[PDB]
Amino acid sequence: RALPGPSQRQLEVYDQCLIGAARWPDDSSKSNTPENRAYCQSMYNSIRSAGDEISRGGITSFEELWGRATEWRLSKLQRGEPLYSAFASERTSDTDAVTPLVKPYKSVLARVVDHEDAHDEIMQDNLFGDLNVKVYRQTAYLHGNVIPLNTFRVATDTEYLRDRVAHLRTELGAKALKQHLQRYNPDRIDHTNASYLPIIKDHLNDLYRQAISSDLSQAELISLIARTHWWAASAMPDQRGSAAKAEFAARAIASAHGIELPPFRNGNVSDIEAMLSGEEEFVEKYRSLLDSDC
Amino acid sequence: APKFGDWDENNPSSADGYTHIFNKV
Ligand SMILES: C[C@@H]1O[C@H](OP(=O)(O)OP(=O)(O)OC[C@H]2O[C@@H](n3ccc(=O)[nH]c3=O)[C@H](O)[C@@H]2O)[C@H](O)[C@H](O)[C@H]1O
């Protein structure tokens, strides 16, 4: 059944230029720039065209949708082939994603440390040895079965470290210490094992199919949108760009039904808000993550 | 004690903050 399609009433432009922003609390400056506001407004446009086609039956699978997001994002890359290939390629089962918690991901470190669901564990490291780490272990539940996802760790014996790290550098050379930190920095996100991605993809086509219904109340539909956005962003299915892509999909599904969601709230980097939360936590909080203030 | 992650000051070997991809050991 065809759907109303994108709204005619459209976010004021101050908002459209925030669509997709990474409005880090600790440096919203980058949200304020000309090039970005260009990037975001581009996104807001390719979303809506995609919405147009969802509402008509042109996008059938969440995989075809994700193609529409991927396609868009690359067209915004002025970088080169080693960078074009990552944003274009699905993460595969013979590899492990990692994100060092450096900058701009320095705000996160508090979010893990004061997280109510945070553990206190030990990270056994061949160079620093044994370390205290506050740990969050995002998990998802599906068909009943538990899925582990991303794993936030923050080393806390911070004085040892700066002392230890300086130690280690002169021996192995910066060359071989950076090697370790690229893969074993004490503070780091260890992402959803790529092996889960086959099934997480079926579940996301199931989820998309339902939300392109025509009978859905305003509450459900959103509850569907928040989920999709949660599952994509948290599985991080592509080597690069998953963050944008996820938000692209979600917002395209919203405009299909004629909804015109706003930019997320400042300091609410949506992918990370979803990585540090369970499914139903995030479904509930979704509405307030959006700057729905007049 | 330093801030969390501020143990990694002025190190030339400080990681680059973005998603990396390695071979499964
Ligand atoms: C994030 C961390 O790194 C990866 O992101 P990646 O490095 O591939 O870059 P984006 O996801 O496109 O960028 C991250 C976010 O910044 C937005 N953006 C980017 C460039 C720009 O010029 N203007 C913008 O507004 C963009 O919309 C996206 O939502 C993973 O995805 C994962 O979510 C997490 O580990």
Side-chain angles (χ1 to χ4, degrees), chain A residues 1-11 13-78 80-115 117-174 176-294, chain B:
Chain A
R1 274 180 114 250
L3 327 179
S7 165
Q8 332 184 338
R9 248 279 292 260
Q10 339 173 63
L11 290 324
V13 295
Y14 162 70
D15 316 333
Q16 297 168 8
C17 308
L18 307 163
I19 288 282
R23 316 177 65 180
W24 300 103
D26 74 352
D27 188 12
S28 294
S29 311
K30 260 244 164 192
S31 288
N32 289 350
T33 64
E35 43 266 18
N36 297 269
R37 289 206 250 87
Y39 166 97
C40 297
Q41 172 160 347
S42 91
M43 185 168 200
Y44 168 92
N45 281 129
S46 295
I47 293 175
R48 291 225 326 168
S49 182
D52 249 344
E53 262 72 64
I54 296 190
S55 99
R56 286 179 165 84
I59 312 195
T60 37
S61 48
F62 186 80
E63 197 88 290
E64 180 148 47
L65 169 36
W66 191 257
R68 215 122 182 162
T70 309
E71 300 182 356
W72 165 76
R73 177 79 181 77
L74 291 177
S75 322
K76 272 304 158 188
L77 286 177
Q78 312 88 6
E81 321 89 18
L83 261 190
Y84 182 103
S85 306
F87 282 85
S89 316
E90 214 187 45
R91 298 190 305 124
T92 40
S93 86
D94 63 350
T95 53
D96 273 348
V98 177
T99 285
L101 282 177
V102 294
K103 296 159 289 242
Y105 314 87
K106 191 155 106 52
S107 309
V108 163
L109 295 144
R111 291 280 254 97
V112 185
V113 155
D114 286 78
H115 207 291
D117 260 1
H119 316 243
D120 282 37
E121 272 143 0
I122 286 308
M123 195 225 298
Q124 299 197 72
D125 193 345
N126 224 295
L127 279 39
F128 301 84
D130 274 357
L131 299 167
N132 307 38
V133 301
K134 313 298 289 303
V135 169
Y136 182 72
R137 299 196 163 246
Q138 201 201 36
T139 63
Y141 309 109
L142 203 288
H143 287 8
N145 299 283
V146 81
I147 273 149
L149 304 171
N150 308 265
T151 295
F152 296 79
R153 326 204 203 263
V154 176
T156 82
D157 172 13
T158 88
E159 42 108 4
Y160 181 165
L161 289 290
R162 163 183 50 59
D163 289 348
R164 186 33 154 201
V165 67
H167 221 183
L168 307 159
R169 176 160 48 60
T170 57
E171 306 74 332
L172 307 92
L177 213 82
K178 177 80 153 322
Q179 281 183 31
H180 223 67
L181 301 173
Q182 271 333 309
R183 219 205 168 289
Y184 295 121
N185 189 49
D187 325 308
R188 69 167 179 287
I189 314 180
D190 286 275
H191 300 278
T192 308
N193 178 327
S195 266
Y196 303 130
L197 293 177
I199 178 139
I200 309 195
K201 289 159 19 58
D202 268 330
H203 172 52
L204 272 152
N205 270 301
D206 223 351
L207 252 198
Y208 167 75
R209 194 106 80 65
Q210 300 178 48
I212 55 142
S213 160
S214 46
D215 64 64
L216 318 150
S217 77
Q218 202 229 341
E220 313 212 78
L221 169 54
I222 278 182
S223 139
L224 273 162
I225 287 172
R227 279 202 219 300
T228 341
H229 188 149
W230 186 74
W231 275 97
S234 279
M236 219 201 62
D238 275 350
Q239 301 178 2
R240 302 286 316 257
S242 280
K245 301 178 198 171
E247 187 196 346
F248 187 111
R251 288 165 171 285
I253 305 182
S255 44
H257 291 279
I259 299 144
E260 199 93 355
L261 323 166
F264 284 97
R265 297 216 66 131
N266 209 307
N268 277 181
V269 181
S270 96
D271 59 293
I272 304 263
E273 296 291 324
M275 294 202 116
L276 293 130
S277 38
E279 189 165 359
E280 310 302 333
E281 188 193 5
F282 188 77
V283 179
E284 196 76 63
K285 57 157 136 201
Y286 203 49
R287 302 184 36 68
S288 85
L289 309 192
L290 306 147
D291 181 323
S292 320
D293 297 338
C294 48
Chain B
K3 262 182 184 181
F4 305 110
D6 281 356
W7 56 266
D8 218 29
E9 250 190 359
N10 33 48
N11 332 111
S13 320
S14 203
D16 293 311
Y18 61 80
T19 311
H20 299 265
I21 294 92
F22 312 81
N23 288 96
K24 265 196 200 196
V25 193

